[PDB]
Design a protein around this motif. Structure first.
Motif, PDB file in Angstrom:
ATOM      1  N   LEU A  17      -1.457  19.268 -18.499  1.00 20.31           N
ATOM      2  CA  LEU A  17      -0.539  19.929 -19.440  1.00 20.31           C
ATOM      3  C   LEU A  17      -1.160  21.224 -19.986  1.00 20.31           C
ATOM      4  O   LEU A  17      -0.285  22.342 -20.188  1.00 20.31           O
ATOM      5  CB  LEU A  17      -0.313  18.928 -20.816  1.00 20.31           C
ATOM      6  CG  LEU A  17       0.719  17.819 -20.612  1.00 20.31           C
ATOM      7  CD1 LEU A  17       0.476  16.874 -21.386  1.00 20.31           C
ATOM      8  CD2 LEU A  17       2.058  18.273 -20.425  1.00 20.31           C
ATOM      9  N   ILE A  21       1.006  25.043 -19.521  1.00 20.35           N
ATOM     10  CA  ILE A  21       0.897  25.982 -20.594  1.00 20.35           C
ATOM     11  C   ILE A  21       0.342  27.312 -20.206  1.00 20.35           C
ATOM     12  O   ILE A  21       1.031  28.488 -20.394  1.00 20.35           O
ATOM     13  CB  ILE A  21       0.440  25.427 -21.774  1.00 20.35           C
ATOM     14  CG1 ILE A  21       1.104  24.121 -22.461  1.00 20.35           C
ATOM     15  CG2 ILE A  21       0.497  26.805 -22.701  1.00 20.35           C
ATOM     16  CD1 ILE A  21       0.225  23.576 -23.759  1.00 20.35           C
ATOM     17  N   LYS A 109       4.804  26.075 -27.663  1.00 16.55           N
ATOM     18  CA  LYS A 109       4.523  25.549 -26.261  1.00 16.55           C
ATOM     19  C   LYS A 109       3.563  24.236 -26.778  1.00 16.55           C
ATOM     20  O   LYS A 109       3.481  23.315 -26.477  1.00 16.55           O
ATOM     21  CB  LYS A 109       4.131  26.212 -25.300  1.00 16.55           C
ATOM     22  CG  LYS A 109       4.999  27.127 -24.680  1.00 16.55           C
ATOM     23  CD  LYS A 109       5.671  26.599 -23.666  1.00 16.55           C
ATOM     24  CE  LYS A 109       6.488  27.828 -22.923  1.00 16.55           C
ATOM     25  NZ  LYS A 109       7.769  27.321 -22.216  1.00 16.55           N
ATOM     26  N   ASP A 112       5.221  21.774 -29.346  1.00 19.19           N
ATOM     27  CA  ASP A 112       6.147  21.127 -28.421  1.00 19.19           C
ATOM     28  C   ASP A 112       5.497  19.948 -27.477  1.00 19.19           C
ATOM     29  O   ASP A 112       6.086  18.950 -27.104  1.00 19.19           O
ATOM     30  CB  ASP A 112       7.216  21.925 -27.737  1.00 19.19           C
ATOM     31  CG  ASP A 112       8.347  22.741 -28.742  1.00 19.19           C
ATOM     32  OD1 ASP A 112       8.056  22.417 -29.844  1.00 19.19           O
ATOM     33  OD2 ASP A 112       8.926  23.536 -28.095  1.00 19.19           O
ATOM     34  N   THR A 113       4.495  20.624 -26.826  1.00 21.07           N
ATOM     35  CA  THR A 113       3.696  19.480 -25.711  1.00 21.07           C
ATOM     36  C   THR A 113       2.938  18.369 -26.406  1.00 21.07           C
ATOM     37  O   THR A 113       2.987  17.475 -25.920  1.00 21.07           O
ATOM     38  CB  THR A 113       2.961  20.427 -24.971  1.00 21.07           C
ATOM     39  OG1 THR A 113       3.793  21.353 -24.265  1.00 21.07           O
ATOM     40  CG2 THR A 113       2.284  19.722 -24.009  1.00 21.07           C
TER      41      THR A 113
END
Length: 115
Positions: A17, A21, A109, A112-113
């Motif tokens: 993840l 990004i 980001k 939200d992640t």
């Protein structure tokens, strides 16, 4: 404390993840000031003033080689890029604006992640 732990948050996807990004930050049109290390031979003042230089390609190499112990150390290097930028560049410059734009893009980001 000893033998007393909060429930285990699943960190097994964090590496993948963070890589996602970073790919999104690399491909942003305002990334150009940040893609490569600042050239310390060709930019007067940088070496003396900016005690810990950081850029997206150095973060990419650290990420790919297991040099981030956890997702927070990754965020600290991304924020360092922008903090360095603000230290050396006026807000009313193309680079100064780029840094504010990318810091915003990142922080959304990140929330939200992970939050």
């Amino acid at each position: 404390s000893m033998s007393v732990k909060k429930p285990k948050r699943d960190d097994s996807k964090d590496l993948a993840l963070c890589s996602m990004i970073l790919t999104e930050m690399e491909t942003h049109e305002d990334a150009w000031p940040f893609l490569l290390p600042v050239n310390l031979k060709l930019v007067p003042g940088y070496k003396k003033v900016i005690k810990k230089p950081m850029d997206f390609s150095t973060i990419r190499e650290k990420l790919s080689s297991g040099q981030y112990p956890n997702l927070e150390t990754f965020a600290l290097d991304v924020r360092l890029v922008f903090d360095n930028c603000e230290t050396f560049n006026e807000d009313d410059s193309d680079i100064g604006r780029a840094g504010h734009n990318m810091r915003k893009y990142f922080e959304k980001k990140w929330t939200d992640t992970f939050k």
